[PDB]
Protein backbone atom coordinates (compact mmCIF):
# COMPACT_ATOMS: atom_id res chain seq x y z
CA UNK A 1 0.00 0.00 0.00
CA UNK A 2 1.15 3.55 -0.70
CA UNK A 3 2.21 5.63 2.30
CA UNK A 4 2.87 9.28 3.06
CA UNK A 5 4.45 11.54 5.68
CA UNK A 6 3.20 15.11 6.17
CA UNK A 7 3.99 18.09 8.38
CA UNK A 8 1.24 20.63 8.95
CA UNK A 9 2.07 24.06 10.40
CA UNK A 10 -0.33 26.77 11.59
CA UNK A 11 0.62 30.25 12.77
CA UNK A 12 -1.90 32.89 13.87
CA UNK A 13 -1.03 36.47 14.83
CA UNK A 14 -2.26 37.72 18.20
CA UNK A 15 -1.93 41.51 17.88
CA UNK A 16 -1.31 42.93 21.34
CA UNK A 17 -1.73 39.47 22.85
CA UNK A 18 1.84 38.25 22.52
CA UNK A 19 3.77 36.41 19.82
CA UNK A 20 1.93 34.39 17.17
CA UNK A 21 0.60 30.98 18.13
CA UNK A 22 2.46 28.19 16.32
CA UNK A 23 1.11 24.63 16.14
CA UNK A 24 3.08 21.88 14.41
CA UNK A 25 1.84 18.31 13.90
CA UNK A 26 3.31 15.48 11.84
CA UNK A 27 1.51 12.51 10.30
CA UNK A 28 2.37 9.18 8.76
CA UNK A 29 -0.67 8.17 6.81
CA UNK A 30 -3.63 8.86 9.12
CA UNK A 31 -1.57 8.55 12.29
CA UNK A 32 -0.23 11.65 14.03
CA UNK A 33 3.19 10.98 15.57
CA UNK A 34 4.59 14.28 16.94
CA UNK A 35 3.53 17.78 17.96
CA UNK A 36 4.84 21.18 19.01
CA UNK A 37 2.86 24.15 20.30
CA UNK A 38 4.23 27.64 20.98
CA UNK A 39 1.84 27.96 23.93
CA UNK A 40 3.23 24.68 25.31
CA UNK A 41 4.99 24.47 28.66
CA UNK A 42 7.72 22.12 27.41
CA UNK A 43 8.74 24.01 24.28
CA UNK A 44 9.74 20.65 22.84
CA UNK A 45 8.67 18.41 20.00
CA UNK A 46 6.49 15.86 21.79
CA UNK A 47 5.50 12.36 20.66
CA UNK A 48 1.86 11.58 19.91
CA UNK A 49 2.28 7.94 18.95
CA UNK A 50 3.76 5.08 21.00
CA UNK A 51 6.12 3.93 18.25
CA UNK A 52 7.86 7.32 18.05
CA UNK A 53 8.47 7.37 21.80
CA UNK A 54 11.18 4.78 21.10
CA UNK A 55 13.33 7.48 19.50
CA UNK A 56 16.30 8.71 21.48
CA UNK A 57 17.23 12.11 22.98
CA UNK A 58 19.09 12.93 19.80
CA UNK A 59 15.88 12.71 17.76
CA UNK A 60 13.82 14.69 20.25
CA UNK A 61 16.49 17.34 20.61
CA UNK A 62 16.91 17.72 16.87
CA UNK A 63 13.21 17.87 16.10
CA UNK A 64 12.74 20.40 18.88
CA UNK A 65 15.58 22.49 17.48
CA UNK A 66 14.22 22.30 13.94
CA UNK A 67 10.53 22.86 14.85
CA UNK A 68 11.25 25.93 16.98
CA UNK A 69 13.19 27.15 13.92
CA UNK A 70 10.07 26.71 11.76
CA UNK A 71 8.17 28.52 14.49
CA UNK A 72 10.41 31.59 14.22
CA UNK A 73 10.30 31.43 10.42
CA UNK A 74 6.50 31.64 10.61
CA UNK A 75 6.69 34.57 13.04
CA UNK A 76 8.70 36.41 10.42
CA UNK A 77 6.36 35.28 7.63
CA UNK A 78 3.29 36.82 9.28
CA UNK A 79 4.99 40.21 9.33
CA UNK A 80 6.24 39.72 5.77
CA UNK A 81 2.86 38.95 4.16
CA UNK A 82 1.22 41.66 6.23
CA UNK A 83 3.72 43.93 4.46
CA UNK A 84 3.12 42.36 1.03
CA UNK A 85 -0.58 43.09 1.43
CA UNK A 86 -0.42 46.45 3.17
CA UNK A 87 -2.37 45.12 6.13
CA UNK A 88 -3.06 46.59 9.55
CA UNK A 89 -0.97 45.44 12.51
CA UNK A 90 -4.19 45.05 14.50
CA UNK A 91 -5.56 42.22 12.37
CA UNK A 92 -4.99 38.57 13.23
CA UNK A 93 -3.74 36.58 10.23
CA UNK A 94 -3.08 32.90 9.50
CA UNK A 95 -0.17 31.26 7.68
CA UNK A 96 -0.38 27.50 7.16
CA UNK A 97 2.37 25.43 5.58
CA UNK A 98 2.36 21.80 4.47
CA UNK A 99 5.09 19.51 3.15
CA UNK A 100 5.57 15.78 2.82
CA UNK A 101 6.24 12.88 0.50
CA UNK A 102 4.26 9.94 -0.81
CA UNK A 103 5.72 6.54 -1.61
CA UNK A 104 4.08 3.85 -3.71
CA UNK A 105 3.31 0.31 -2.62
CA UNK A 106 6.99 -0.33 -3.35
CA UNK A 107 7.88 2.30 -0.72
CA UNK A 108 9.55 4.30 -3.49
CA UNK A 109 9.22 8.07 -3.96
CA UNK A 110 5.99 9.06 -5.73
CA UNK A 111 5.60 12.78 -4.95
CA UNK A 112 6.63 15.61 -2.64
CA UNK A 113 4.63 18.61 -1.43
CA UNK A 114 5.49 22.06 -0.12
CA UNK A 115 2.60 24.51 -0.02
CA UNK A 116 1.58 27.61 1.94
CA UNK A 117 -1.72 29.43 2.45
CA UNK A 118 -2.44 32.89 3.79
CA UNK A 119 -5.84 33.31 5.46
CA UNK A 120 -7.05 30.12 3.73
CA UNK A 121 -6.03 31.17 0.23
CA UNK A 122 -3.21 29.29 -1.52
CA UNK A 123 -0.12 31.49 -1.52
CA UNK A 124 2.71 29.48 -3.09
CA UNK A 125 3.18 25.81 -3.98
CA UNK A 126 6.01 23.63 -5.25
CA UNK A 127 4.89 22.26 -8.61
CA UNK A 128 4.98 18.49 -9.21
CA UNK A 129 8.28 18.69 -11.13
CA UNK A 130 9.94 19.66 -7.85
CA UNK A 131 11.56 22.40 -9.93
CA UNK A 132 8.93 25.14 -10.25
CA UNK A 133 6.66 27.24 -8.07
CA UNK A 134 3.02 28.22 -8.47
CA UNK A 135 3.01 31.83 -7.28
CA UNK A 136 -0.63 32.76 -6.76
CA UNK A 137 -0.36 36.53 -7.20
CA UNK A 138 2.11 39.43 -7.17
CA UNK A 139 2.92 38.93 -3.49
CA UNK A 140 3.40 35.19 -3.97
CA UNK A 141 5.52 36.10 -7.01
CA UNK A 142 7.88 38.11 -4.81
CA UNK A 143 8.39 35.05 -2.62
CA UNK A 144 8.85 32.91 -5.73
CA UNK A 145 11.70 35.04 -7.08
CA UNK A 146 13.40 34.98 -3.68
CA UNK A 147 13.18 31.21 -3.69
CA UNK A 148 14.29 30.79 -7.28
CA UNK A 149 17.25 33.02 -6.45
CA UNK A 150 18.07 31.19 -3.22
CA UNK A 151 17.62 27.84 -5.02
CA UNK A 152 15.12 26.54 -2.50
CA UNK A 153 13.55 23.94 -4.80
CA UNK A 154 16.85 22.07 -5.09
CA UNK A 155 17.21 21.75 -1.32
CA UNK A 156 13.58 20.68 -1.11
CA UNK A 157 13.98 18.13 -3.89
CA UNK A 158 16.76 16.45 -1.93
CA UNK A 159 14.56 16.42 1.19
CA UNK A 160 11.30 15.27 -0.38
CA UNK A 161 13.10 12.57 -2.38
CA UNK A 162 15.79 11.56 0.10
CA UNK A 163 15.42 12.32 3.79
CA UNK A 164 11.61 12.49 3.77
CA UNK A 165 11.29 9.09 2.09
CA UNK A 166 14.07 7.64 4.24
CA UNK A 167 12.35 8.60 7.50
CA UNK A 168 8.98 7.46 6.19
CA UNK A 169 10.22 3.91 5.55
CA UNK A 170 11.90 3.96 8.98
CA UNK A 171 8.71 5.02 10.74
CA UNK A 172 6.80 2.48 8.69
CA UNK A 173 9.07 -0.29 9.91
CA UNK A 174 9.56 0.95 13.47
CA UNK A 175 5.82 1.34 13.94
CA UNK A 176 4.87 -1.69 11.83
CA UNK A 177 2.07 -3.15 14.00
CA UNK A 178 0.34 0.23 13.91
CA UNK A 179 1.25 1.80 10.56
CA UNK A 180 1.34 -1.43 8.58
CA UNK A 181 -2.06 -2.69 9.68
CA UNK A 182 -5.34 -2.52 7.76
CA UNK A 183 -8.41 -2.74 9.99
CA UNK A 184 -11.45 -3.78 7.94
CA UNK A 185 -14.60 -1.87 8.94
CA UNK A 186 -17.19 -3.43 11.22
CA UNK A 187 -20.33 -2.86 9.17
CA UNK A 188 -24.00 -2.98 10.14
CA UNK A 189 -27.25 -1.21 9.28
CA UNK A 190 -29.99 0.45 11.31
CA UNK A 191 -33.65 0.79 10.39
CA UNK A 192 -35.68 3.58 11.98
CA UNK A 193 -39.25 4.42 11.00
CA UNK A 194 -39.45 8.12 10.21
CA UNK A 195 -43.13 8.04 9.27
CA UNK A 196 -45.95 5.60 8.57
CA UNK A 197 -44.76 5.40 4.95
CA UNK A 198 -40.97 5.86 5.05
CA UNK A 199 -37.93 4.67 6.97
CA UNK A 200 -34.26 5.54 7.28
CA UNK A 201 -31.69 2.89 6.40
CA UNK A 202 -28.18 3.66 7.67
CA UNK A 203 -25.09 1.69 6.74
CA UNK A 204 -22.20 1.80 9.19
CA UNK A 205 -18.46 1.35 8.75
CA UNK A 206 -16.59 1.40 12.09
CA UNK A 207 -13.16 0.55 13.56
CA UNK A 208 -11.36 0.82 10.23
CA UNK A 209 -7.82 1.82 9.28
CA UNK A 210 -6.66 3.48 7.12
CA UNK A 211 -9.36 6.15 6.76
CA UNK A 212 -9.76 5.62 3.00
CA UNK A 213 -13.17 4.07 2.31
CA UNK A 214 -16.10 4.09 -0.12
CA UNK A 215 -19.58 3.72 1.36
CA UNK A 216 -22.47 3.88 -1.12
CA UNK A 217 -26.17 2.95 -1.41
CA UNK A 218 -27.92 1.57 -4.51
CA UNK A 219 -31.54 0.86 -5.42
CA UNK A 220 -31.75 -2.03 -7.88
CA UNK A 221 -28.03 -1.69 -8.50
CA UNK A 222 -28.66 1.91 -9.57
CA UNK A 223 -26.54 4.33 -7.53
CA UNK A 224 -28.33 6.68 -5.14
CA UNK A 225 -25.59 9.30 -4.82
CA UNK A 226 -28.02 12.20 -5.13
CA UNK A 227 -30.30 10.63 -2.52
CA UNK A 228 -27.76 9.40 0.03
CA UNK A 229 -26.77 11.13 3.26
CA UNK A 230 -23.08 10.40 3.58
CA UNK A 231 -21.12 11.89 6.46
CA UNK A 232 -17.47 12.90 6.54
CA UNK A 233 -15.16 10.13 7.82
CA UNK A 234 -14.82 10.73 11.56
CA UNK A 235 -11.94 9.64 13.77
CA UNK A 236 -13.08 7.20 16.46
CA UNK A 237 -10.53 8.76 18.79
CA UNK A 238 -8.56 5.56 19.21
CA UNK A 239 -6.74 5.47 15.90
CA UNK A 240 -9.57 4.04 13.81
CA UNK A 241 -12.32 5.84 11.90
CA UNK A 242 -16.07 5.78 11.31
CA UNK A 243 -18.53 6.79 8.57
CA UNK A 244 -22.16 6.27 7.61
CA UNK A 245 -24.42 6.61 4.59
CA UNK A 246 -28.22 6.75 4.93
CA UNK A 247 -31.20 6.67 2.54
CA UNK A 248 -34.92 7.18 3.10
CA UNK A 249 -36.70 4.06 1.90
CA UNK A 250 -40.41 3.94 1.15
CA UNK A 251 -41.77 1.11 3.32
CA UNK A 252 -41.79 -2.27 1.60
CA UNK A 253 -38.80 -1.22 -0.51
CA UNK A 254 -35.95 -2.10 1.88
CA UNK A 255 -35.13 -5.13 -0.28
CA UNK A 256 -34.42 -2.92 -3.31
CA UNK A 257 -31.56 -1.26 -1.45
CA UNK A 258 -27.99 -2.44 -1.08
CA UNK A 259 -25.13 -0.80 0.78
CA UNK A 260 -21.59 -1.20 -0.52
CA UNK A 261 -18.37 -0.92 1.45
CA UNK A 262 -14.91 -0.73 -0.14
CA UNK A 263 -11.81 -0.63 2.05
CA UNK A 264 -8.17 -1.77 1.83
CA UNK A 265 -8.54 -4.25 4.69
CA UNK A 266 -11.58 -5.84 3.02
CA UNK A 267 -10.74 -9.05 1.11
CA UNK A 268 -13.68 -8.47 -1.24
CA UNK A 269 -16.07 -5.46 -1.20
CA UNK A 270 -19.27 -5.82 0.80
CA UNK A 271 -22.85 -5.65 -0.44
CA UNK A 272 -25.33 -5.44 2.41
CA UNK A 273 -29.09 -5.63 1.85
CA UNK A 274 -31.79 -5.19 4.48
CA UNK A 275 -33.55 -8.52 4.82
Amino acid sequence: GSHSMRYFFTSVSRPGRGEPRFIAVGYVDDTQFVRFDSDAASQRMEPRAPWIEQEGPEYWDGETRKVKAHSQTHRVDLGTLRGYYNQSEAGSHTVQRMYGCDVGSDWRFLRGYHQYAYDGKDYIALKEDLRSWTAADMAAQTTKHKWEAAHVAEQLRAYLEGTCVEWLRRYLENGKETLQRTDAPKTHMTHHAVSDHEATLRCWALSFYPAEITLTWQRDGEDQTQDTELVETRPAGDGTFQKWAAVVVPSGQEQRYTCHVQHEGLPKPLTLRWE
Partner: protein
Protein backbone atom coordinates in the same frame (compact mmCIF):
# COMPACT_ATOMS: atom_id res chain seq x y z
CA UNK B 1 -10.90 36.98 4.49
CA UNK B 2 -11.97 33.35 4.16
CA UNK B 3 -14.41 32.22 6.83
CA UNK B 4 -15.50 28.59 6.43
CA UNK B 5 -18.24 27.05 8.60
CA UNK B 6 -17.44 23.97 10.73
CA UNK B 7 -19.28 20.71 10.18
CA UNK B 8 -20.25 19.10 13.47
CA UNK B 9 -20.41 15.40 14.33
CA UNK B 10 -21.28 14.30 17.85
CA UNK B 11 -20.80 10.55 18.21
CA UNK B 12 -19.19 7.98 20.49
CA UNK B 13 -16.10 5.82 19.97
CA UNK B 14 -17.89 2.51 20.50
CA UNK B 15 -21.58 1.66 20.05
CA UNK B 16 -23.53 3.13 22.96
CA UNK B 17 -24.42 0.46 25.52
CA UNK B 18 -25.85 1.87 28.74
CA UNK B 19 -23.76 1.33 31.85
CA UNK B 20 -20.62 0.78 29.77
CA UNK B 21 -17.74 3.28 29.64
CA UNK B 22 -17.09 5.00 26.31
CA UNK B 23 -15.95 8.30 24.80
CA UNK B 24 -18.25 11.07 23.57
CA UNK B 25 -16.71 12.75 20.54
CA UNK B 26 -17.46 15.99 18.74
CA UNK B 27 -15.61 16.26 15.45
CA UNK B 28 -15.44 19.79 14.03
CA UNK B 29 -13.90 20.32 10.59
CA UNK B 30 -13.96 22.35 7.40
CA UNK B 31 -13.76 25.66 9.26
CA UNK B 32 -11.62 28.75 8.95
CA UNK B 33 -10.16 30.51 10.79
CA UNK B 34 -8.87 28.19 13.55
CA UNK B 35 -10.61 30.04 16.40
CA UNK B 36 -13.60 27.98 17.53
CA UNK B 37 -15.30 27.31 20.86
CA UNK B 38 -16.42 23.69 21.16
CA UNK B 39 -18.11 22.26 24.25
CA UNK B 40 -19.61 18.92 25.20
CA UNK B 41 -22.78 19.09 27.33
CA UNK B 42 -24.49 16.60 29.65
CA UNK B 43 -28.14 17.43 30.23
CA UNK B 44 -27.35 21.02 29.35
CA UNK B 45 -24.25 21.39 31.53
CA UNK B 46 -20.83 21.98 30.02
CA UNK B 47 -18.44 19.11 30.77
CA UNK B 48 -15.16 20.20 32.39
CA UNK B 49 -12.60 17.54 31.42
CA UNK B 50 -12.95 17.63 27.64
CA UNK B 51 -9.88 17.21 25.47
CA UNK B 52 -9.25 17.90 21.82
CA UNK B 53 -6.81 16.76 19.16
CA UNK B 54 -3.90 18.86 17.96
CA UNK B 55 -4.87 21.55 15.47
CA UNK B 56 -4.35 20.27 11.93
CA UNK B 57 -6.04 20.88 8.57
CA UNK B 58 -6.95 19.19 5.26
CA UNK B 59 -5.63 19.74 1.71
CA UNK B 60 -7.94 22.76 1.37
CA UNK B 61 -6.43 24.34 4.50
CA UNK B 62 -9.68 23.90 6.42
CA UNK B 63 -9.09 22.99 10.05
CA UNK B 64 -10.27 19.98 12.04
CA UNK B 65 -10.19 19.02 15.72
CA UNK B 66 -11.64 16.20 17.79
CA UNK B 67 -13.08 17.09 21.18
CA UNK B 68 -13.60 14.04 23.38
CA UNK B 69 -14.40 13.00 26.94
CA UNK B 70 -14.94 9.71 28.77
CA UNK B 71 -18.59 8.92 29.45
CA UNK B 72 -20.90 6.04 30.28
CA UNK B 73 -24.14 6.29 28.27
CA UNK B 74 -27.43 5.99 30.13
CA UNK B 75 -30.99 5.33 28.99
CA UNK B 76 -32.00 8.82 30.07
CA UNK B 77 -28.88 11.00 29.75
CA UNK B 78 -28.74 13.51 26.91
CA UNK B 79 -25.50 14.81 25.43
CA UNK B 80 -24.80 17.52 22.86
CA UNK B 81 -22.00 19.54 21.30
CA UNK B 82 -22.15 23.33 21.31
CA UNK B 83 -19.87 25.08 18.82
CA UNK B 84 -19.23 28.74 18.10
CA UNK B 85 -17.27 30.35 15.28
CA UNK B 86 -17.18 33.73 13.47
CA UNK B 87 -19.44 32.15 10.87
CA UNK B 88 -22.14 31.38 13.44
CA UNK B 89 -24.40 34.17 14.70
CA UNK B 90 -25.21 31.88 17.64
CA UNK B 91 -23.57 28.75 19.08
CA UNK B 92 -24.74 25.75 17.05
CA UNK B 93 -25.99 22.90 19.24
CA UNK B 94 -25.98 19.39 17.79
CA UNK B 95 -27.55 16.73 20.01
CA UNK B 96 -26.02 13.30 20.32
CA UNK B 97 -28.18 10.62 18.74
CA UNK B 98 -26.70 7.16 19.30
CA UNK B 99 -28.02 6.17 15.85
CA UNK B 100 -25.75 8.73 14.13
Amino acid sequence: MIQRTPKIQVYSRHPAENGKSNFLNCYVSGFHPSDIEVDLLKNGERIEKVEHSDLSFSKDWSFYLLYYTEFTPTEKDEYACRVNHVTLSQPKIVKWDRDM
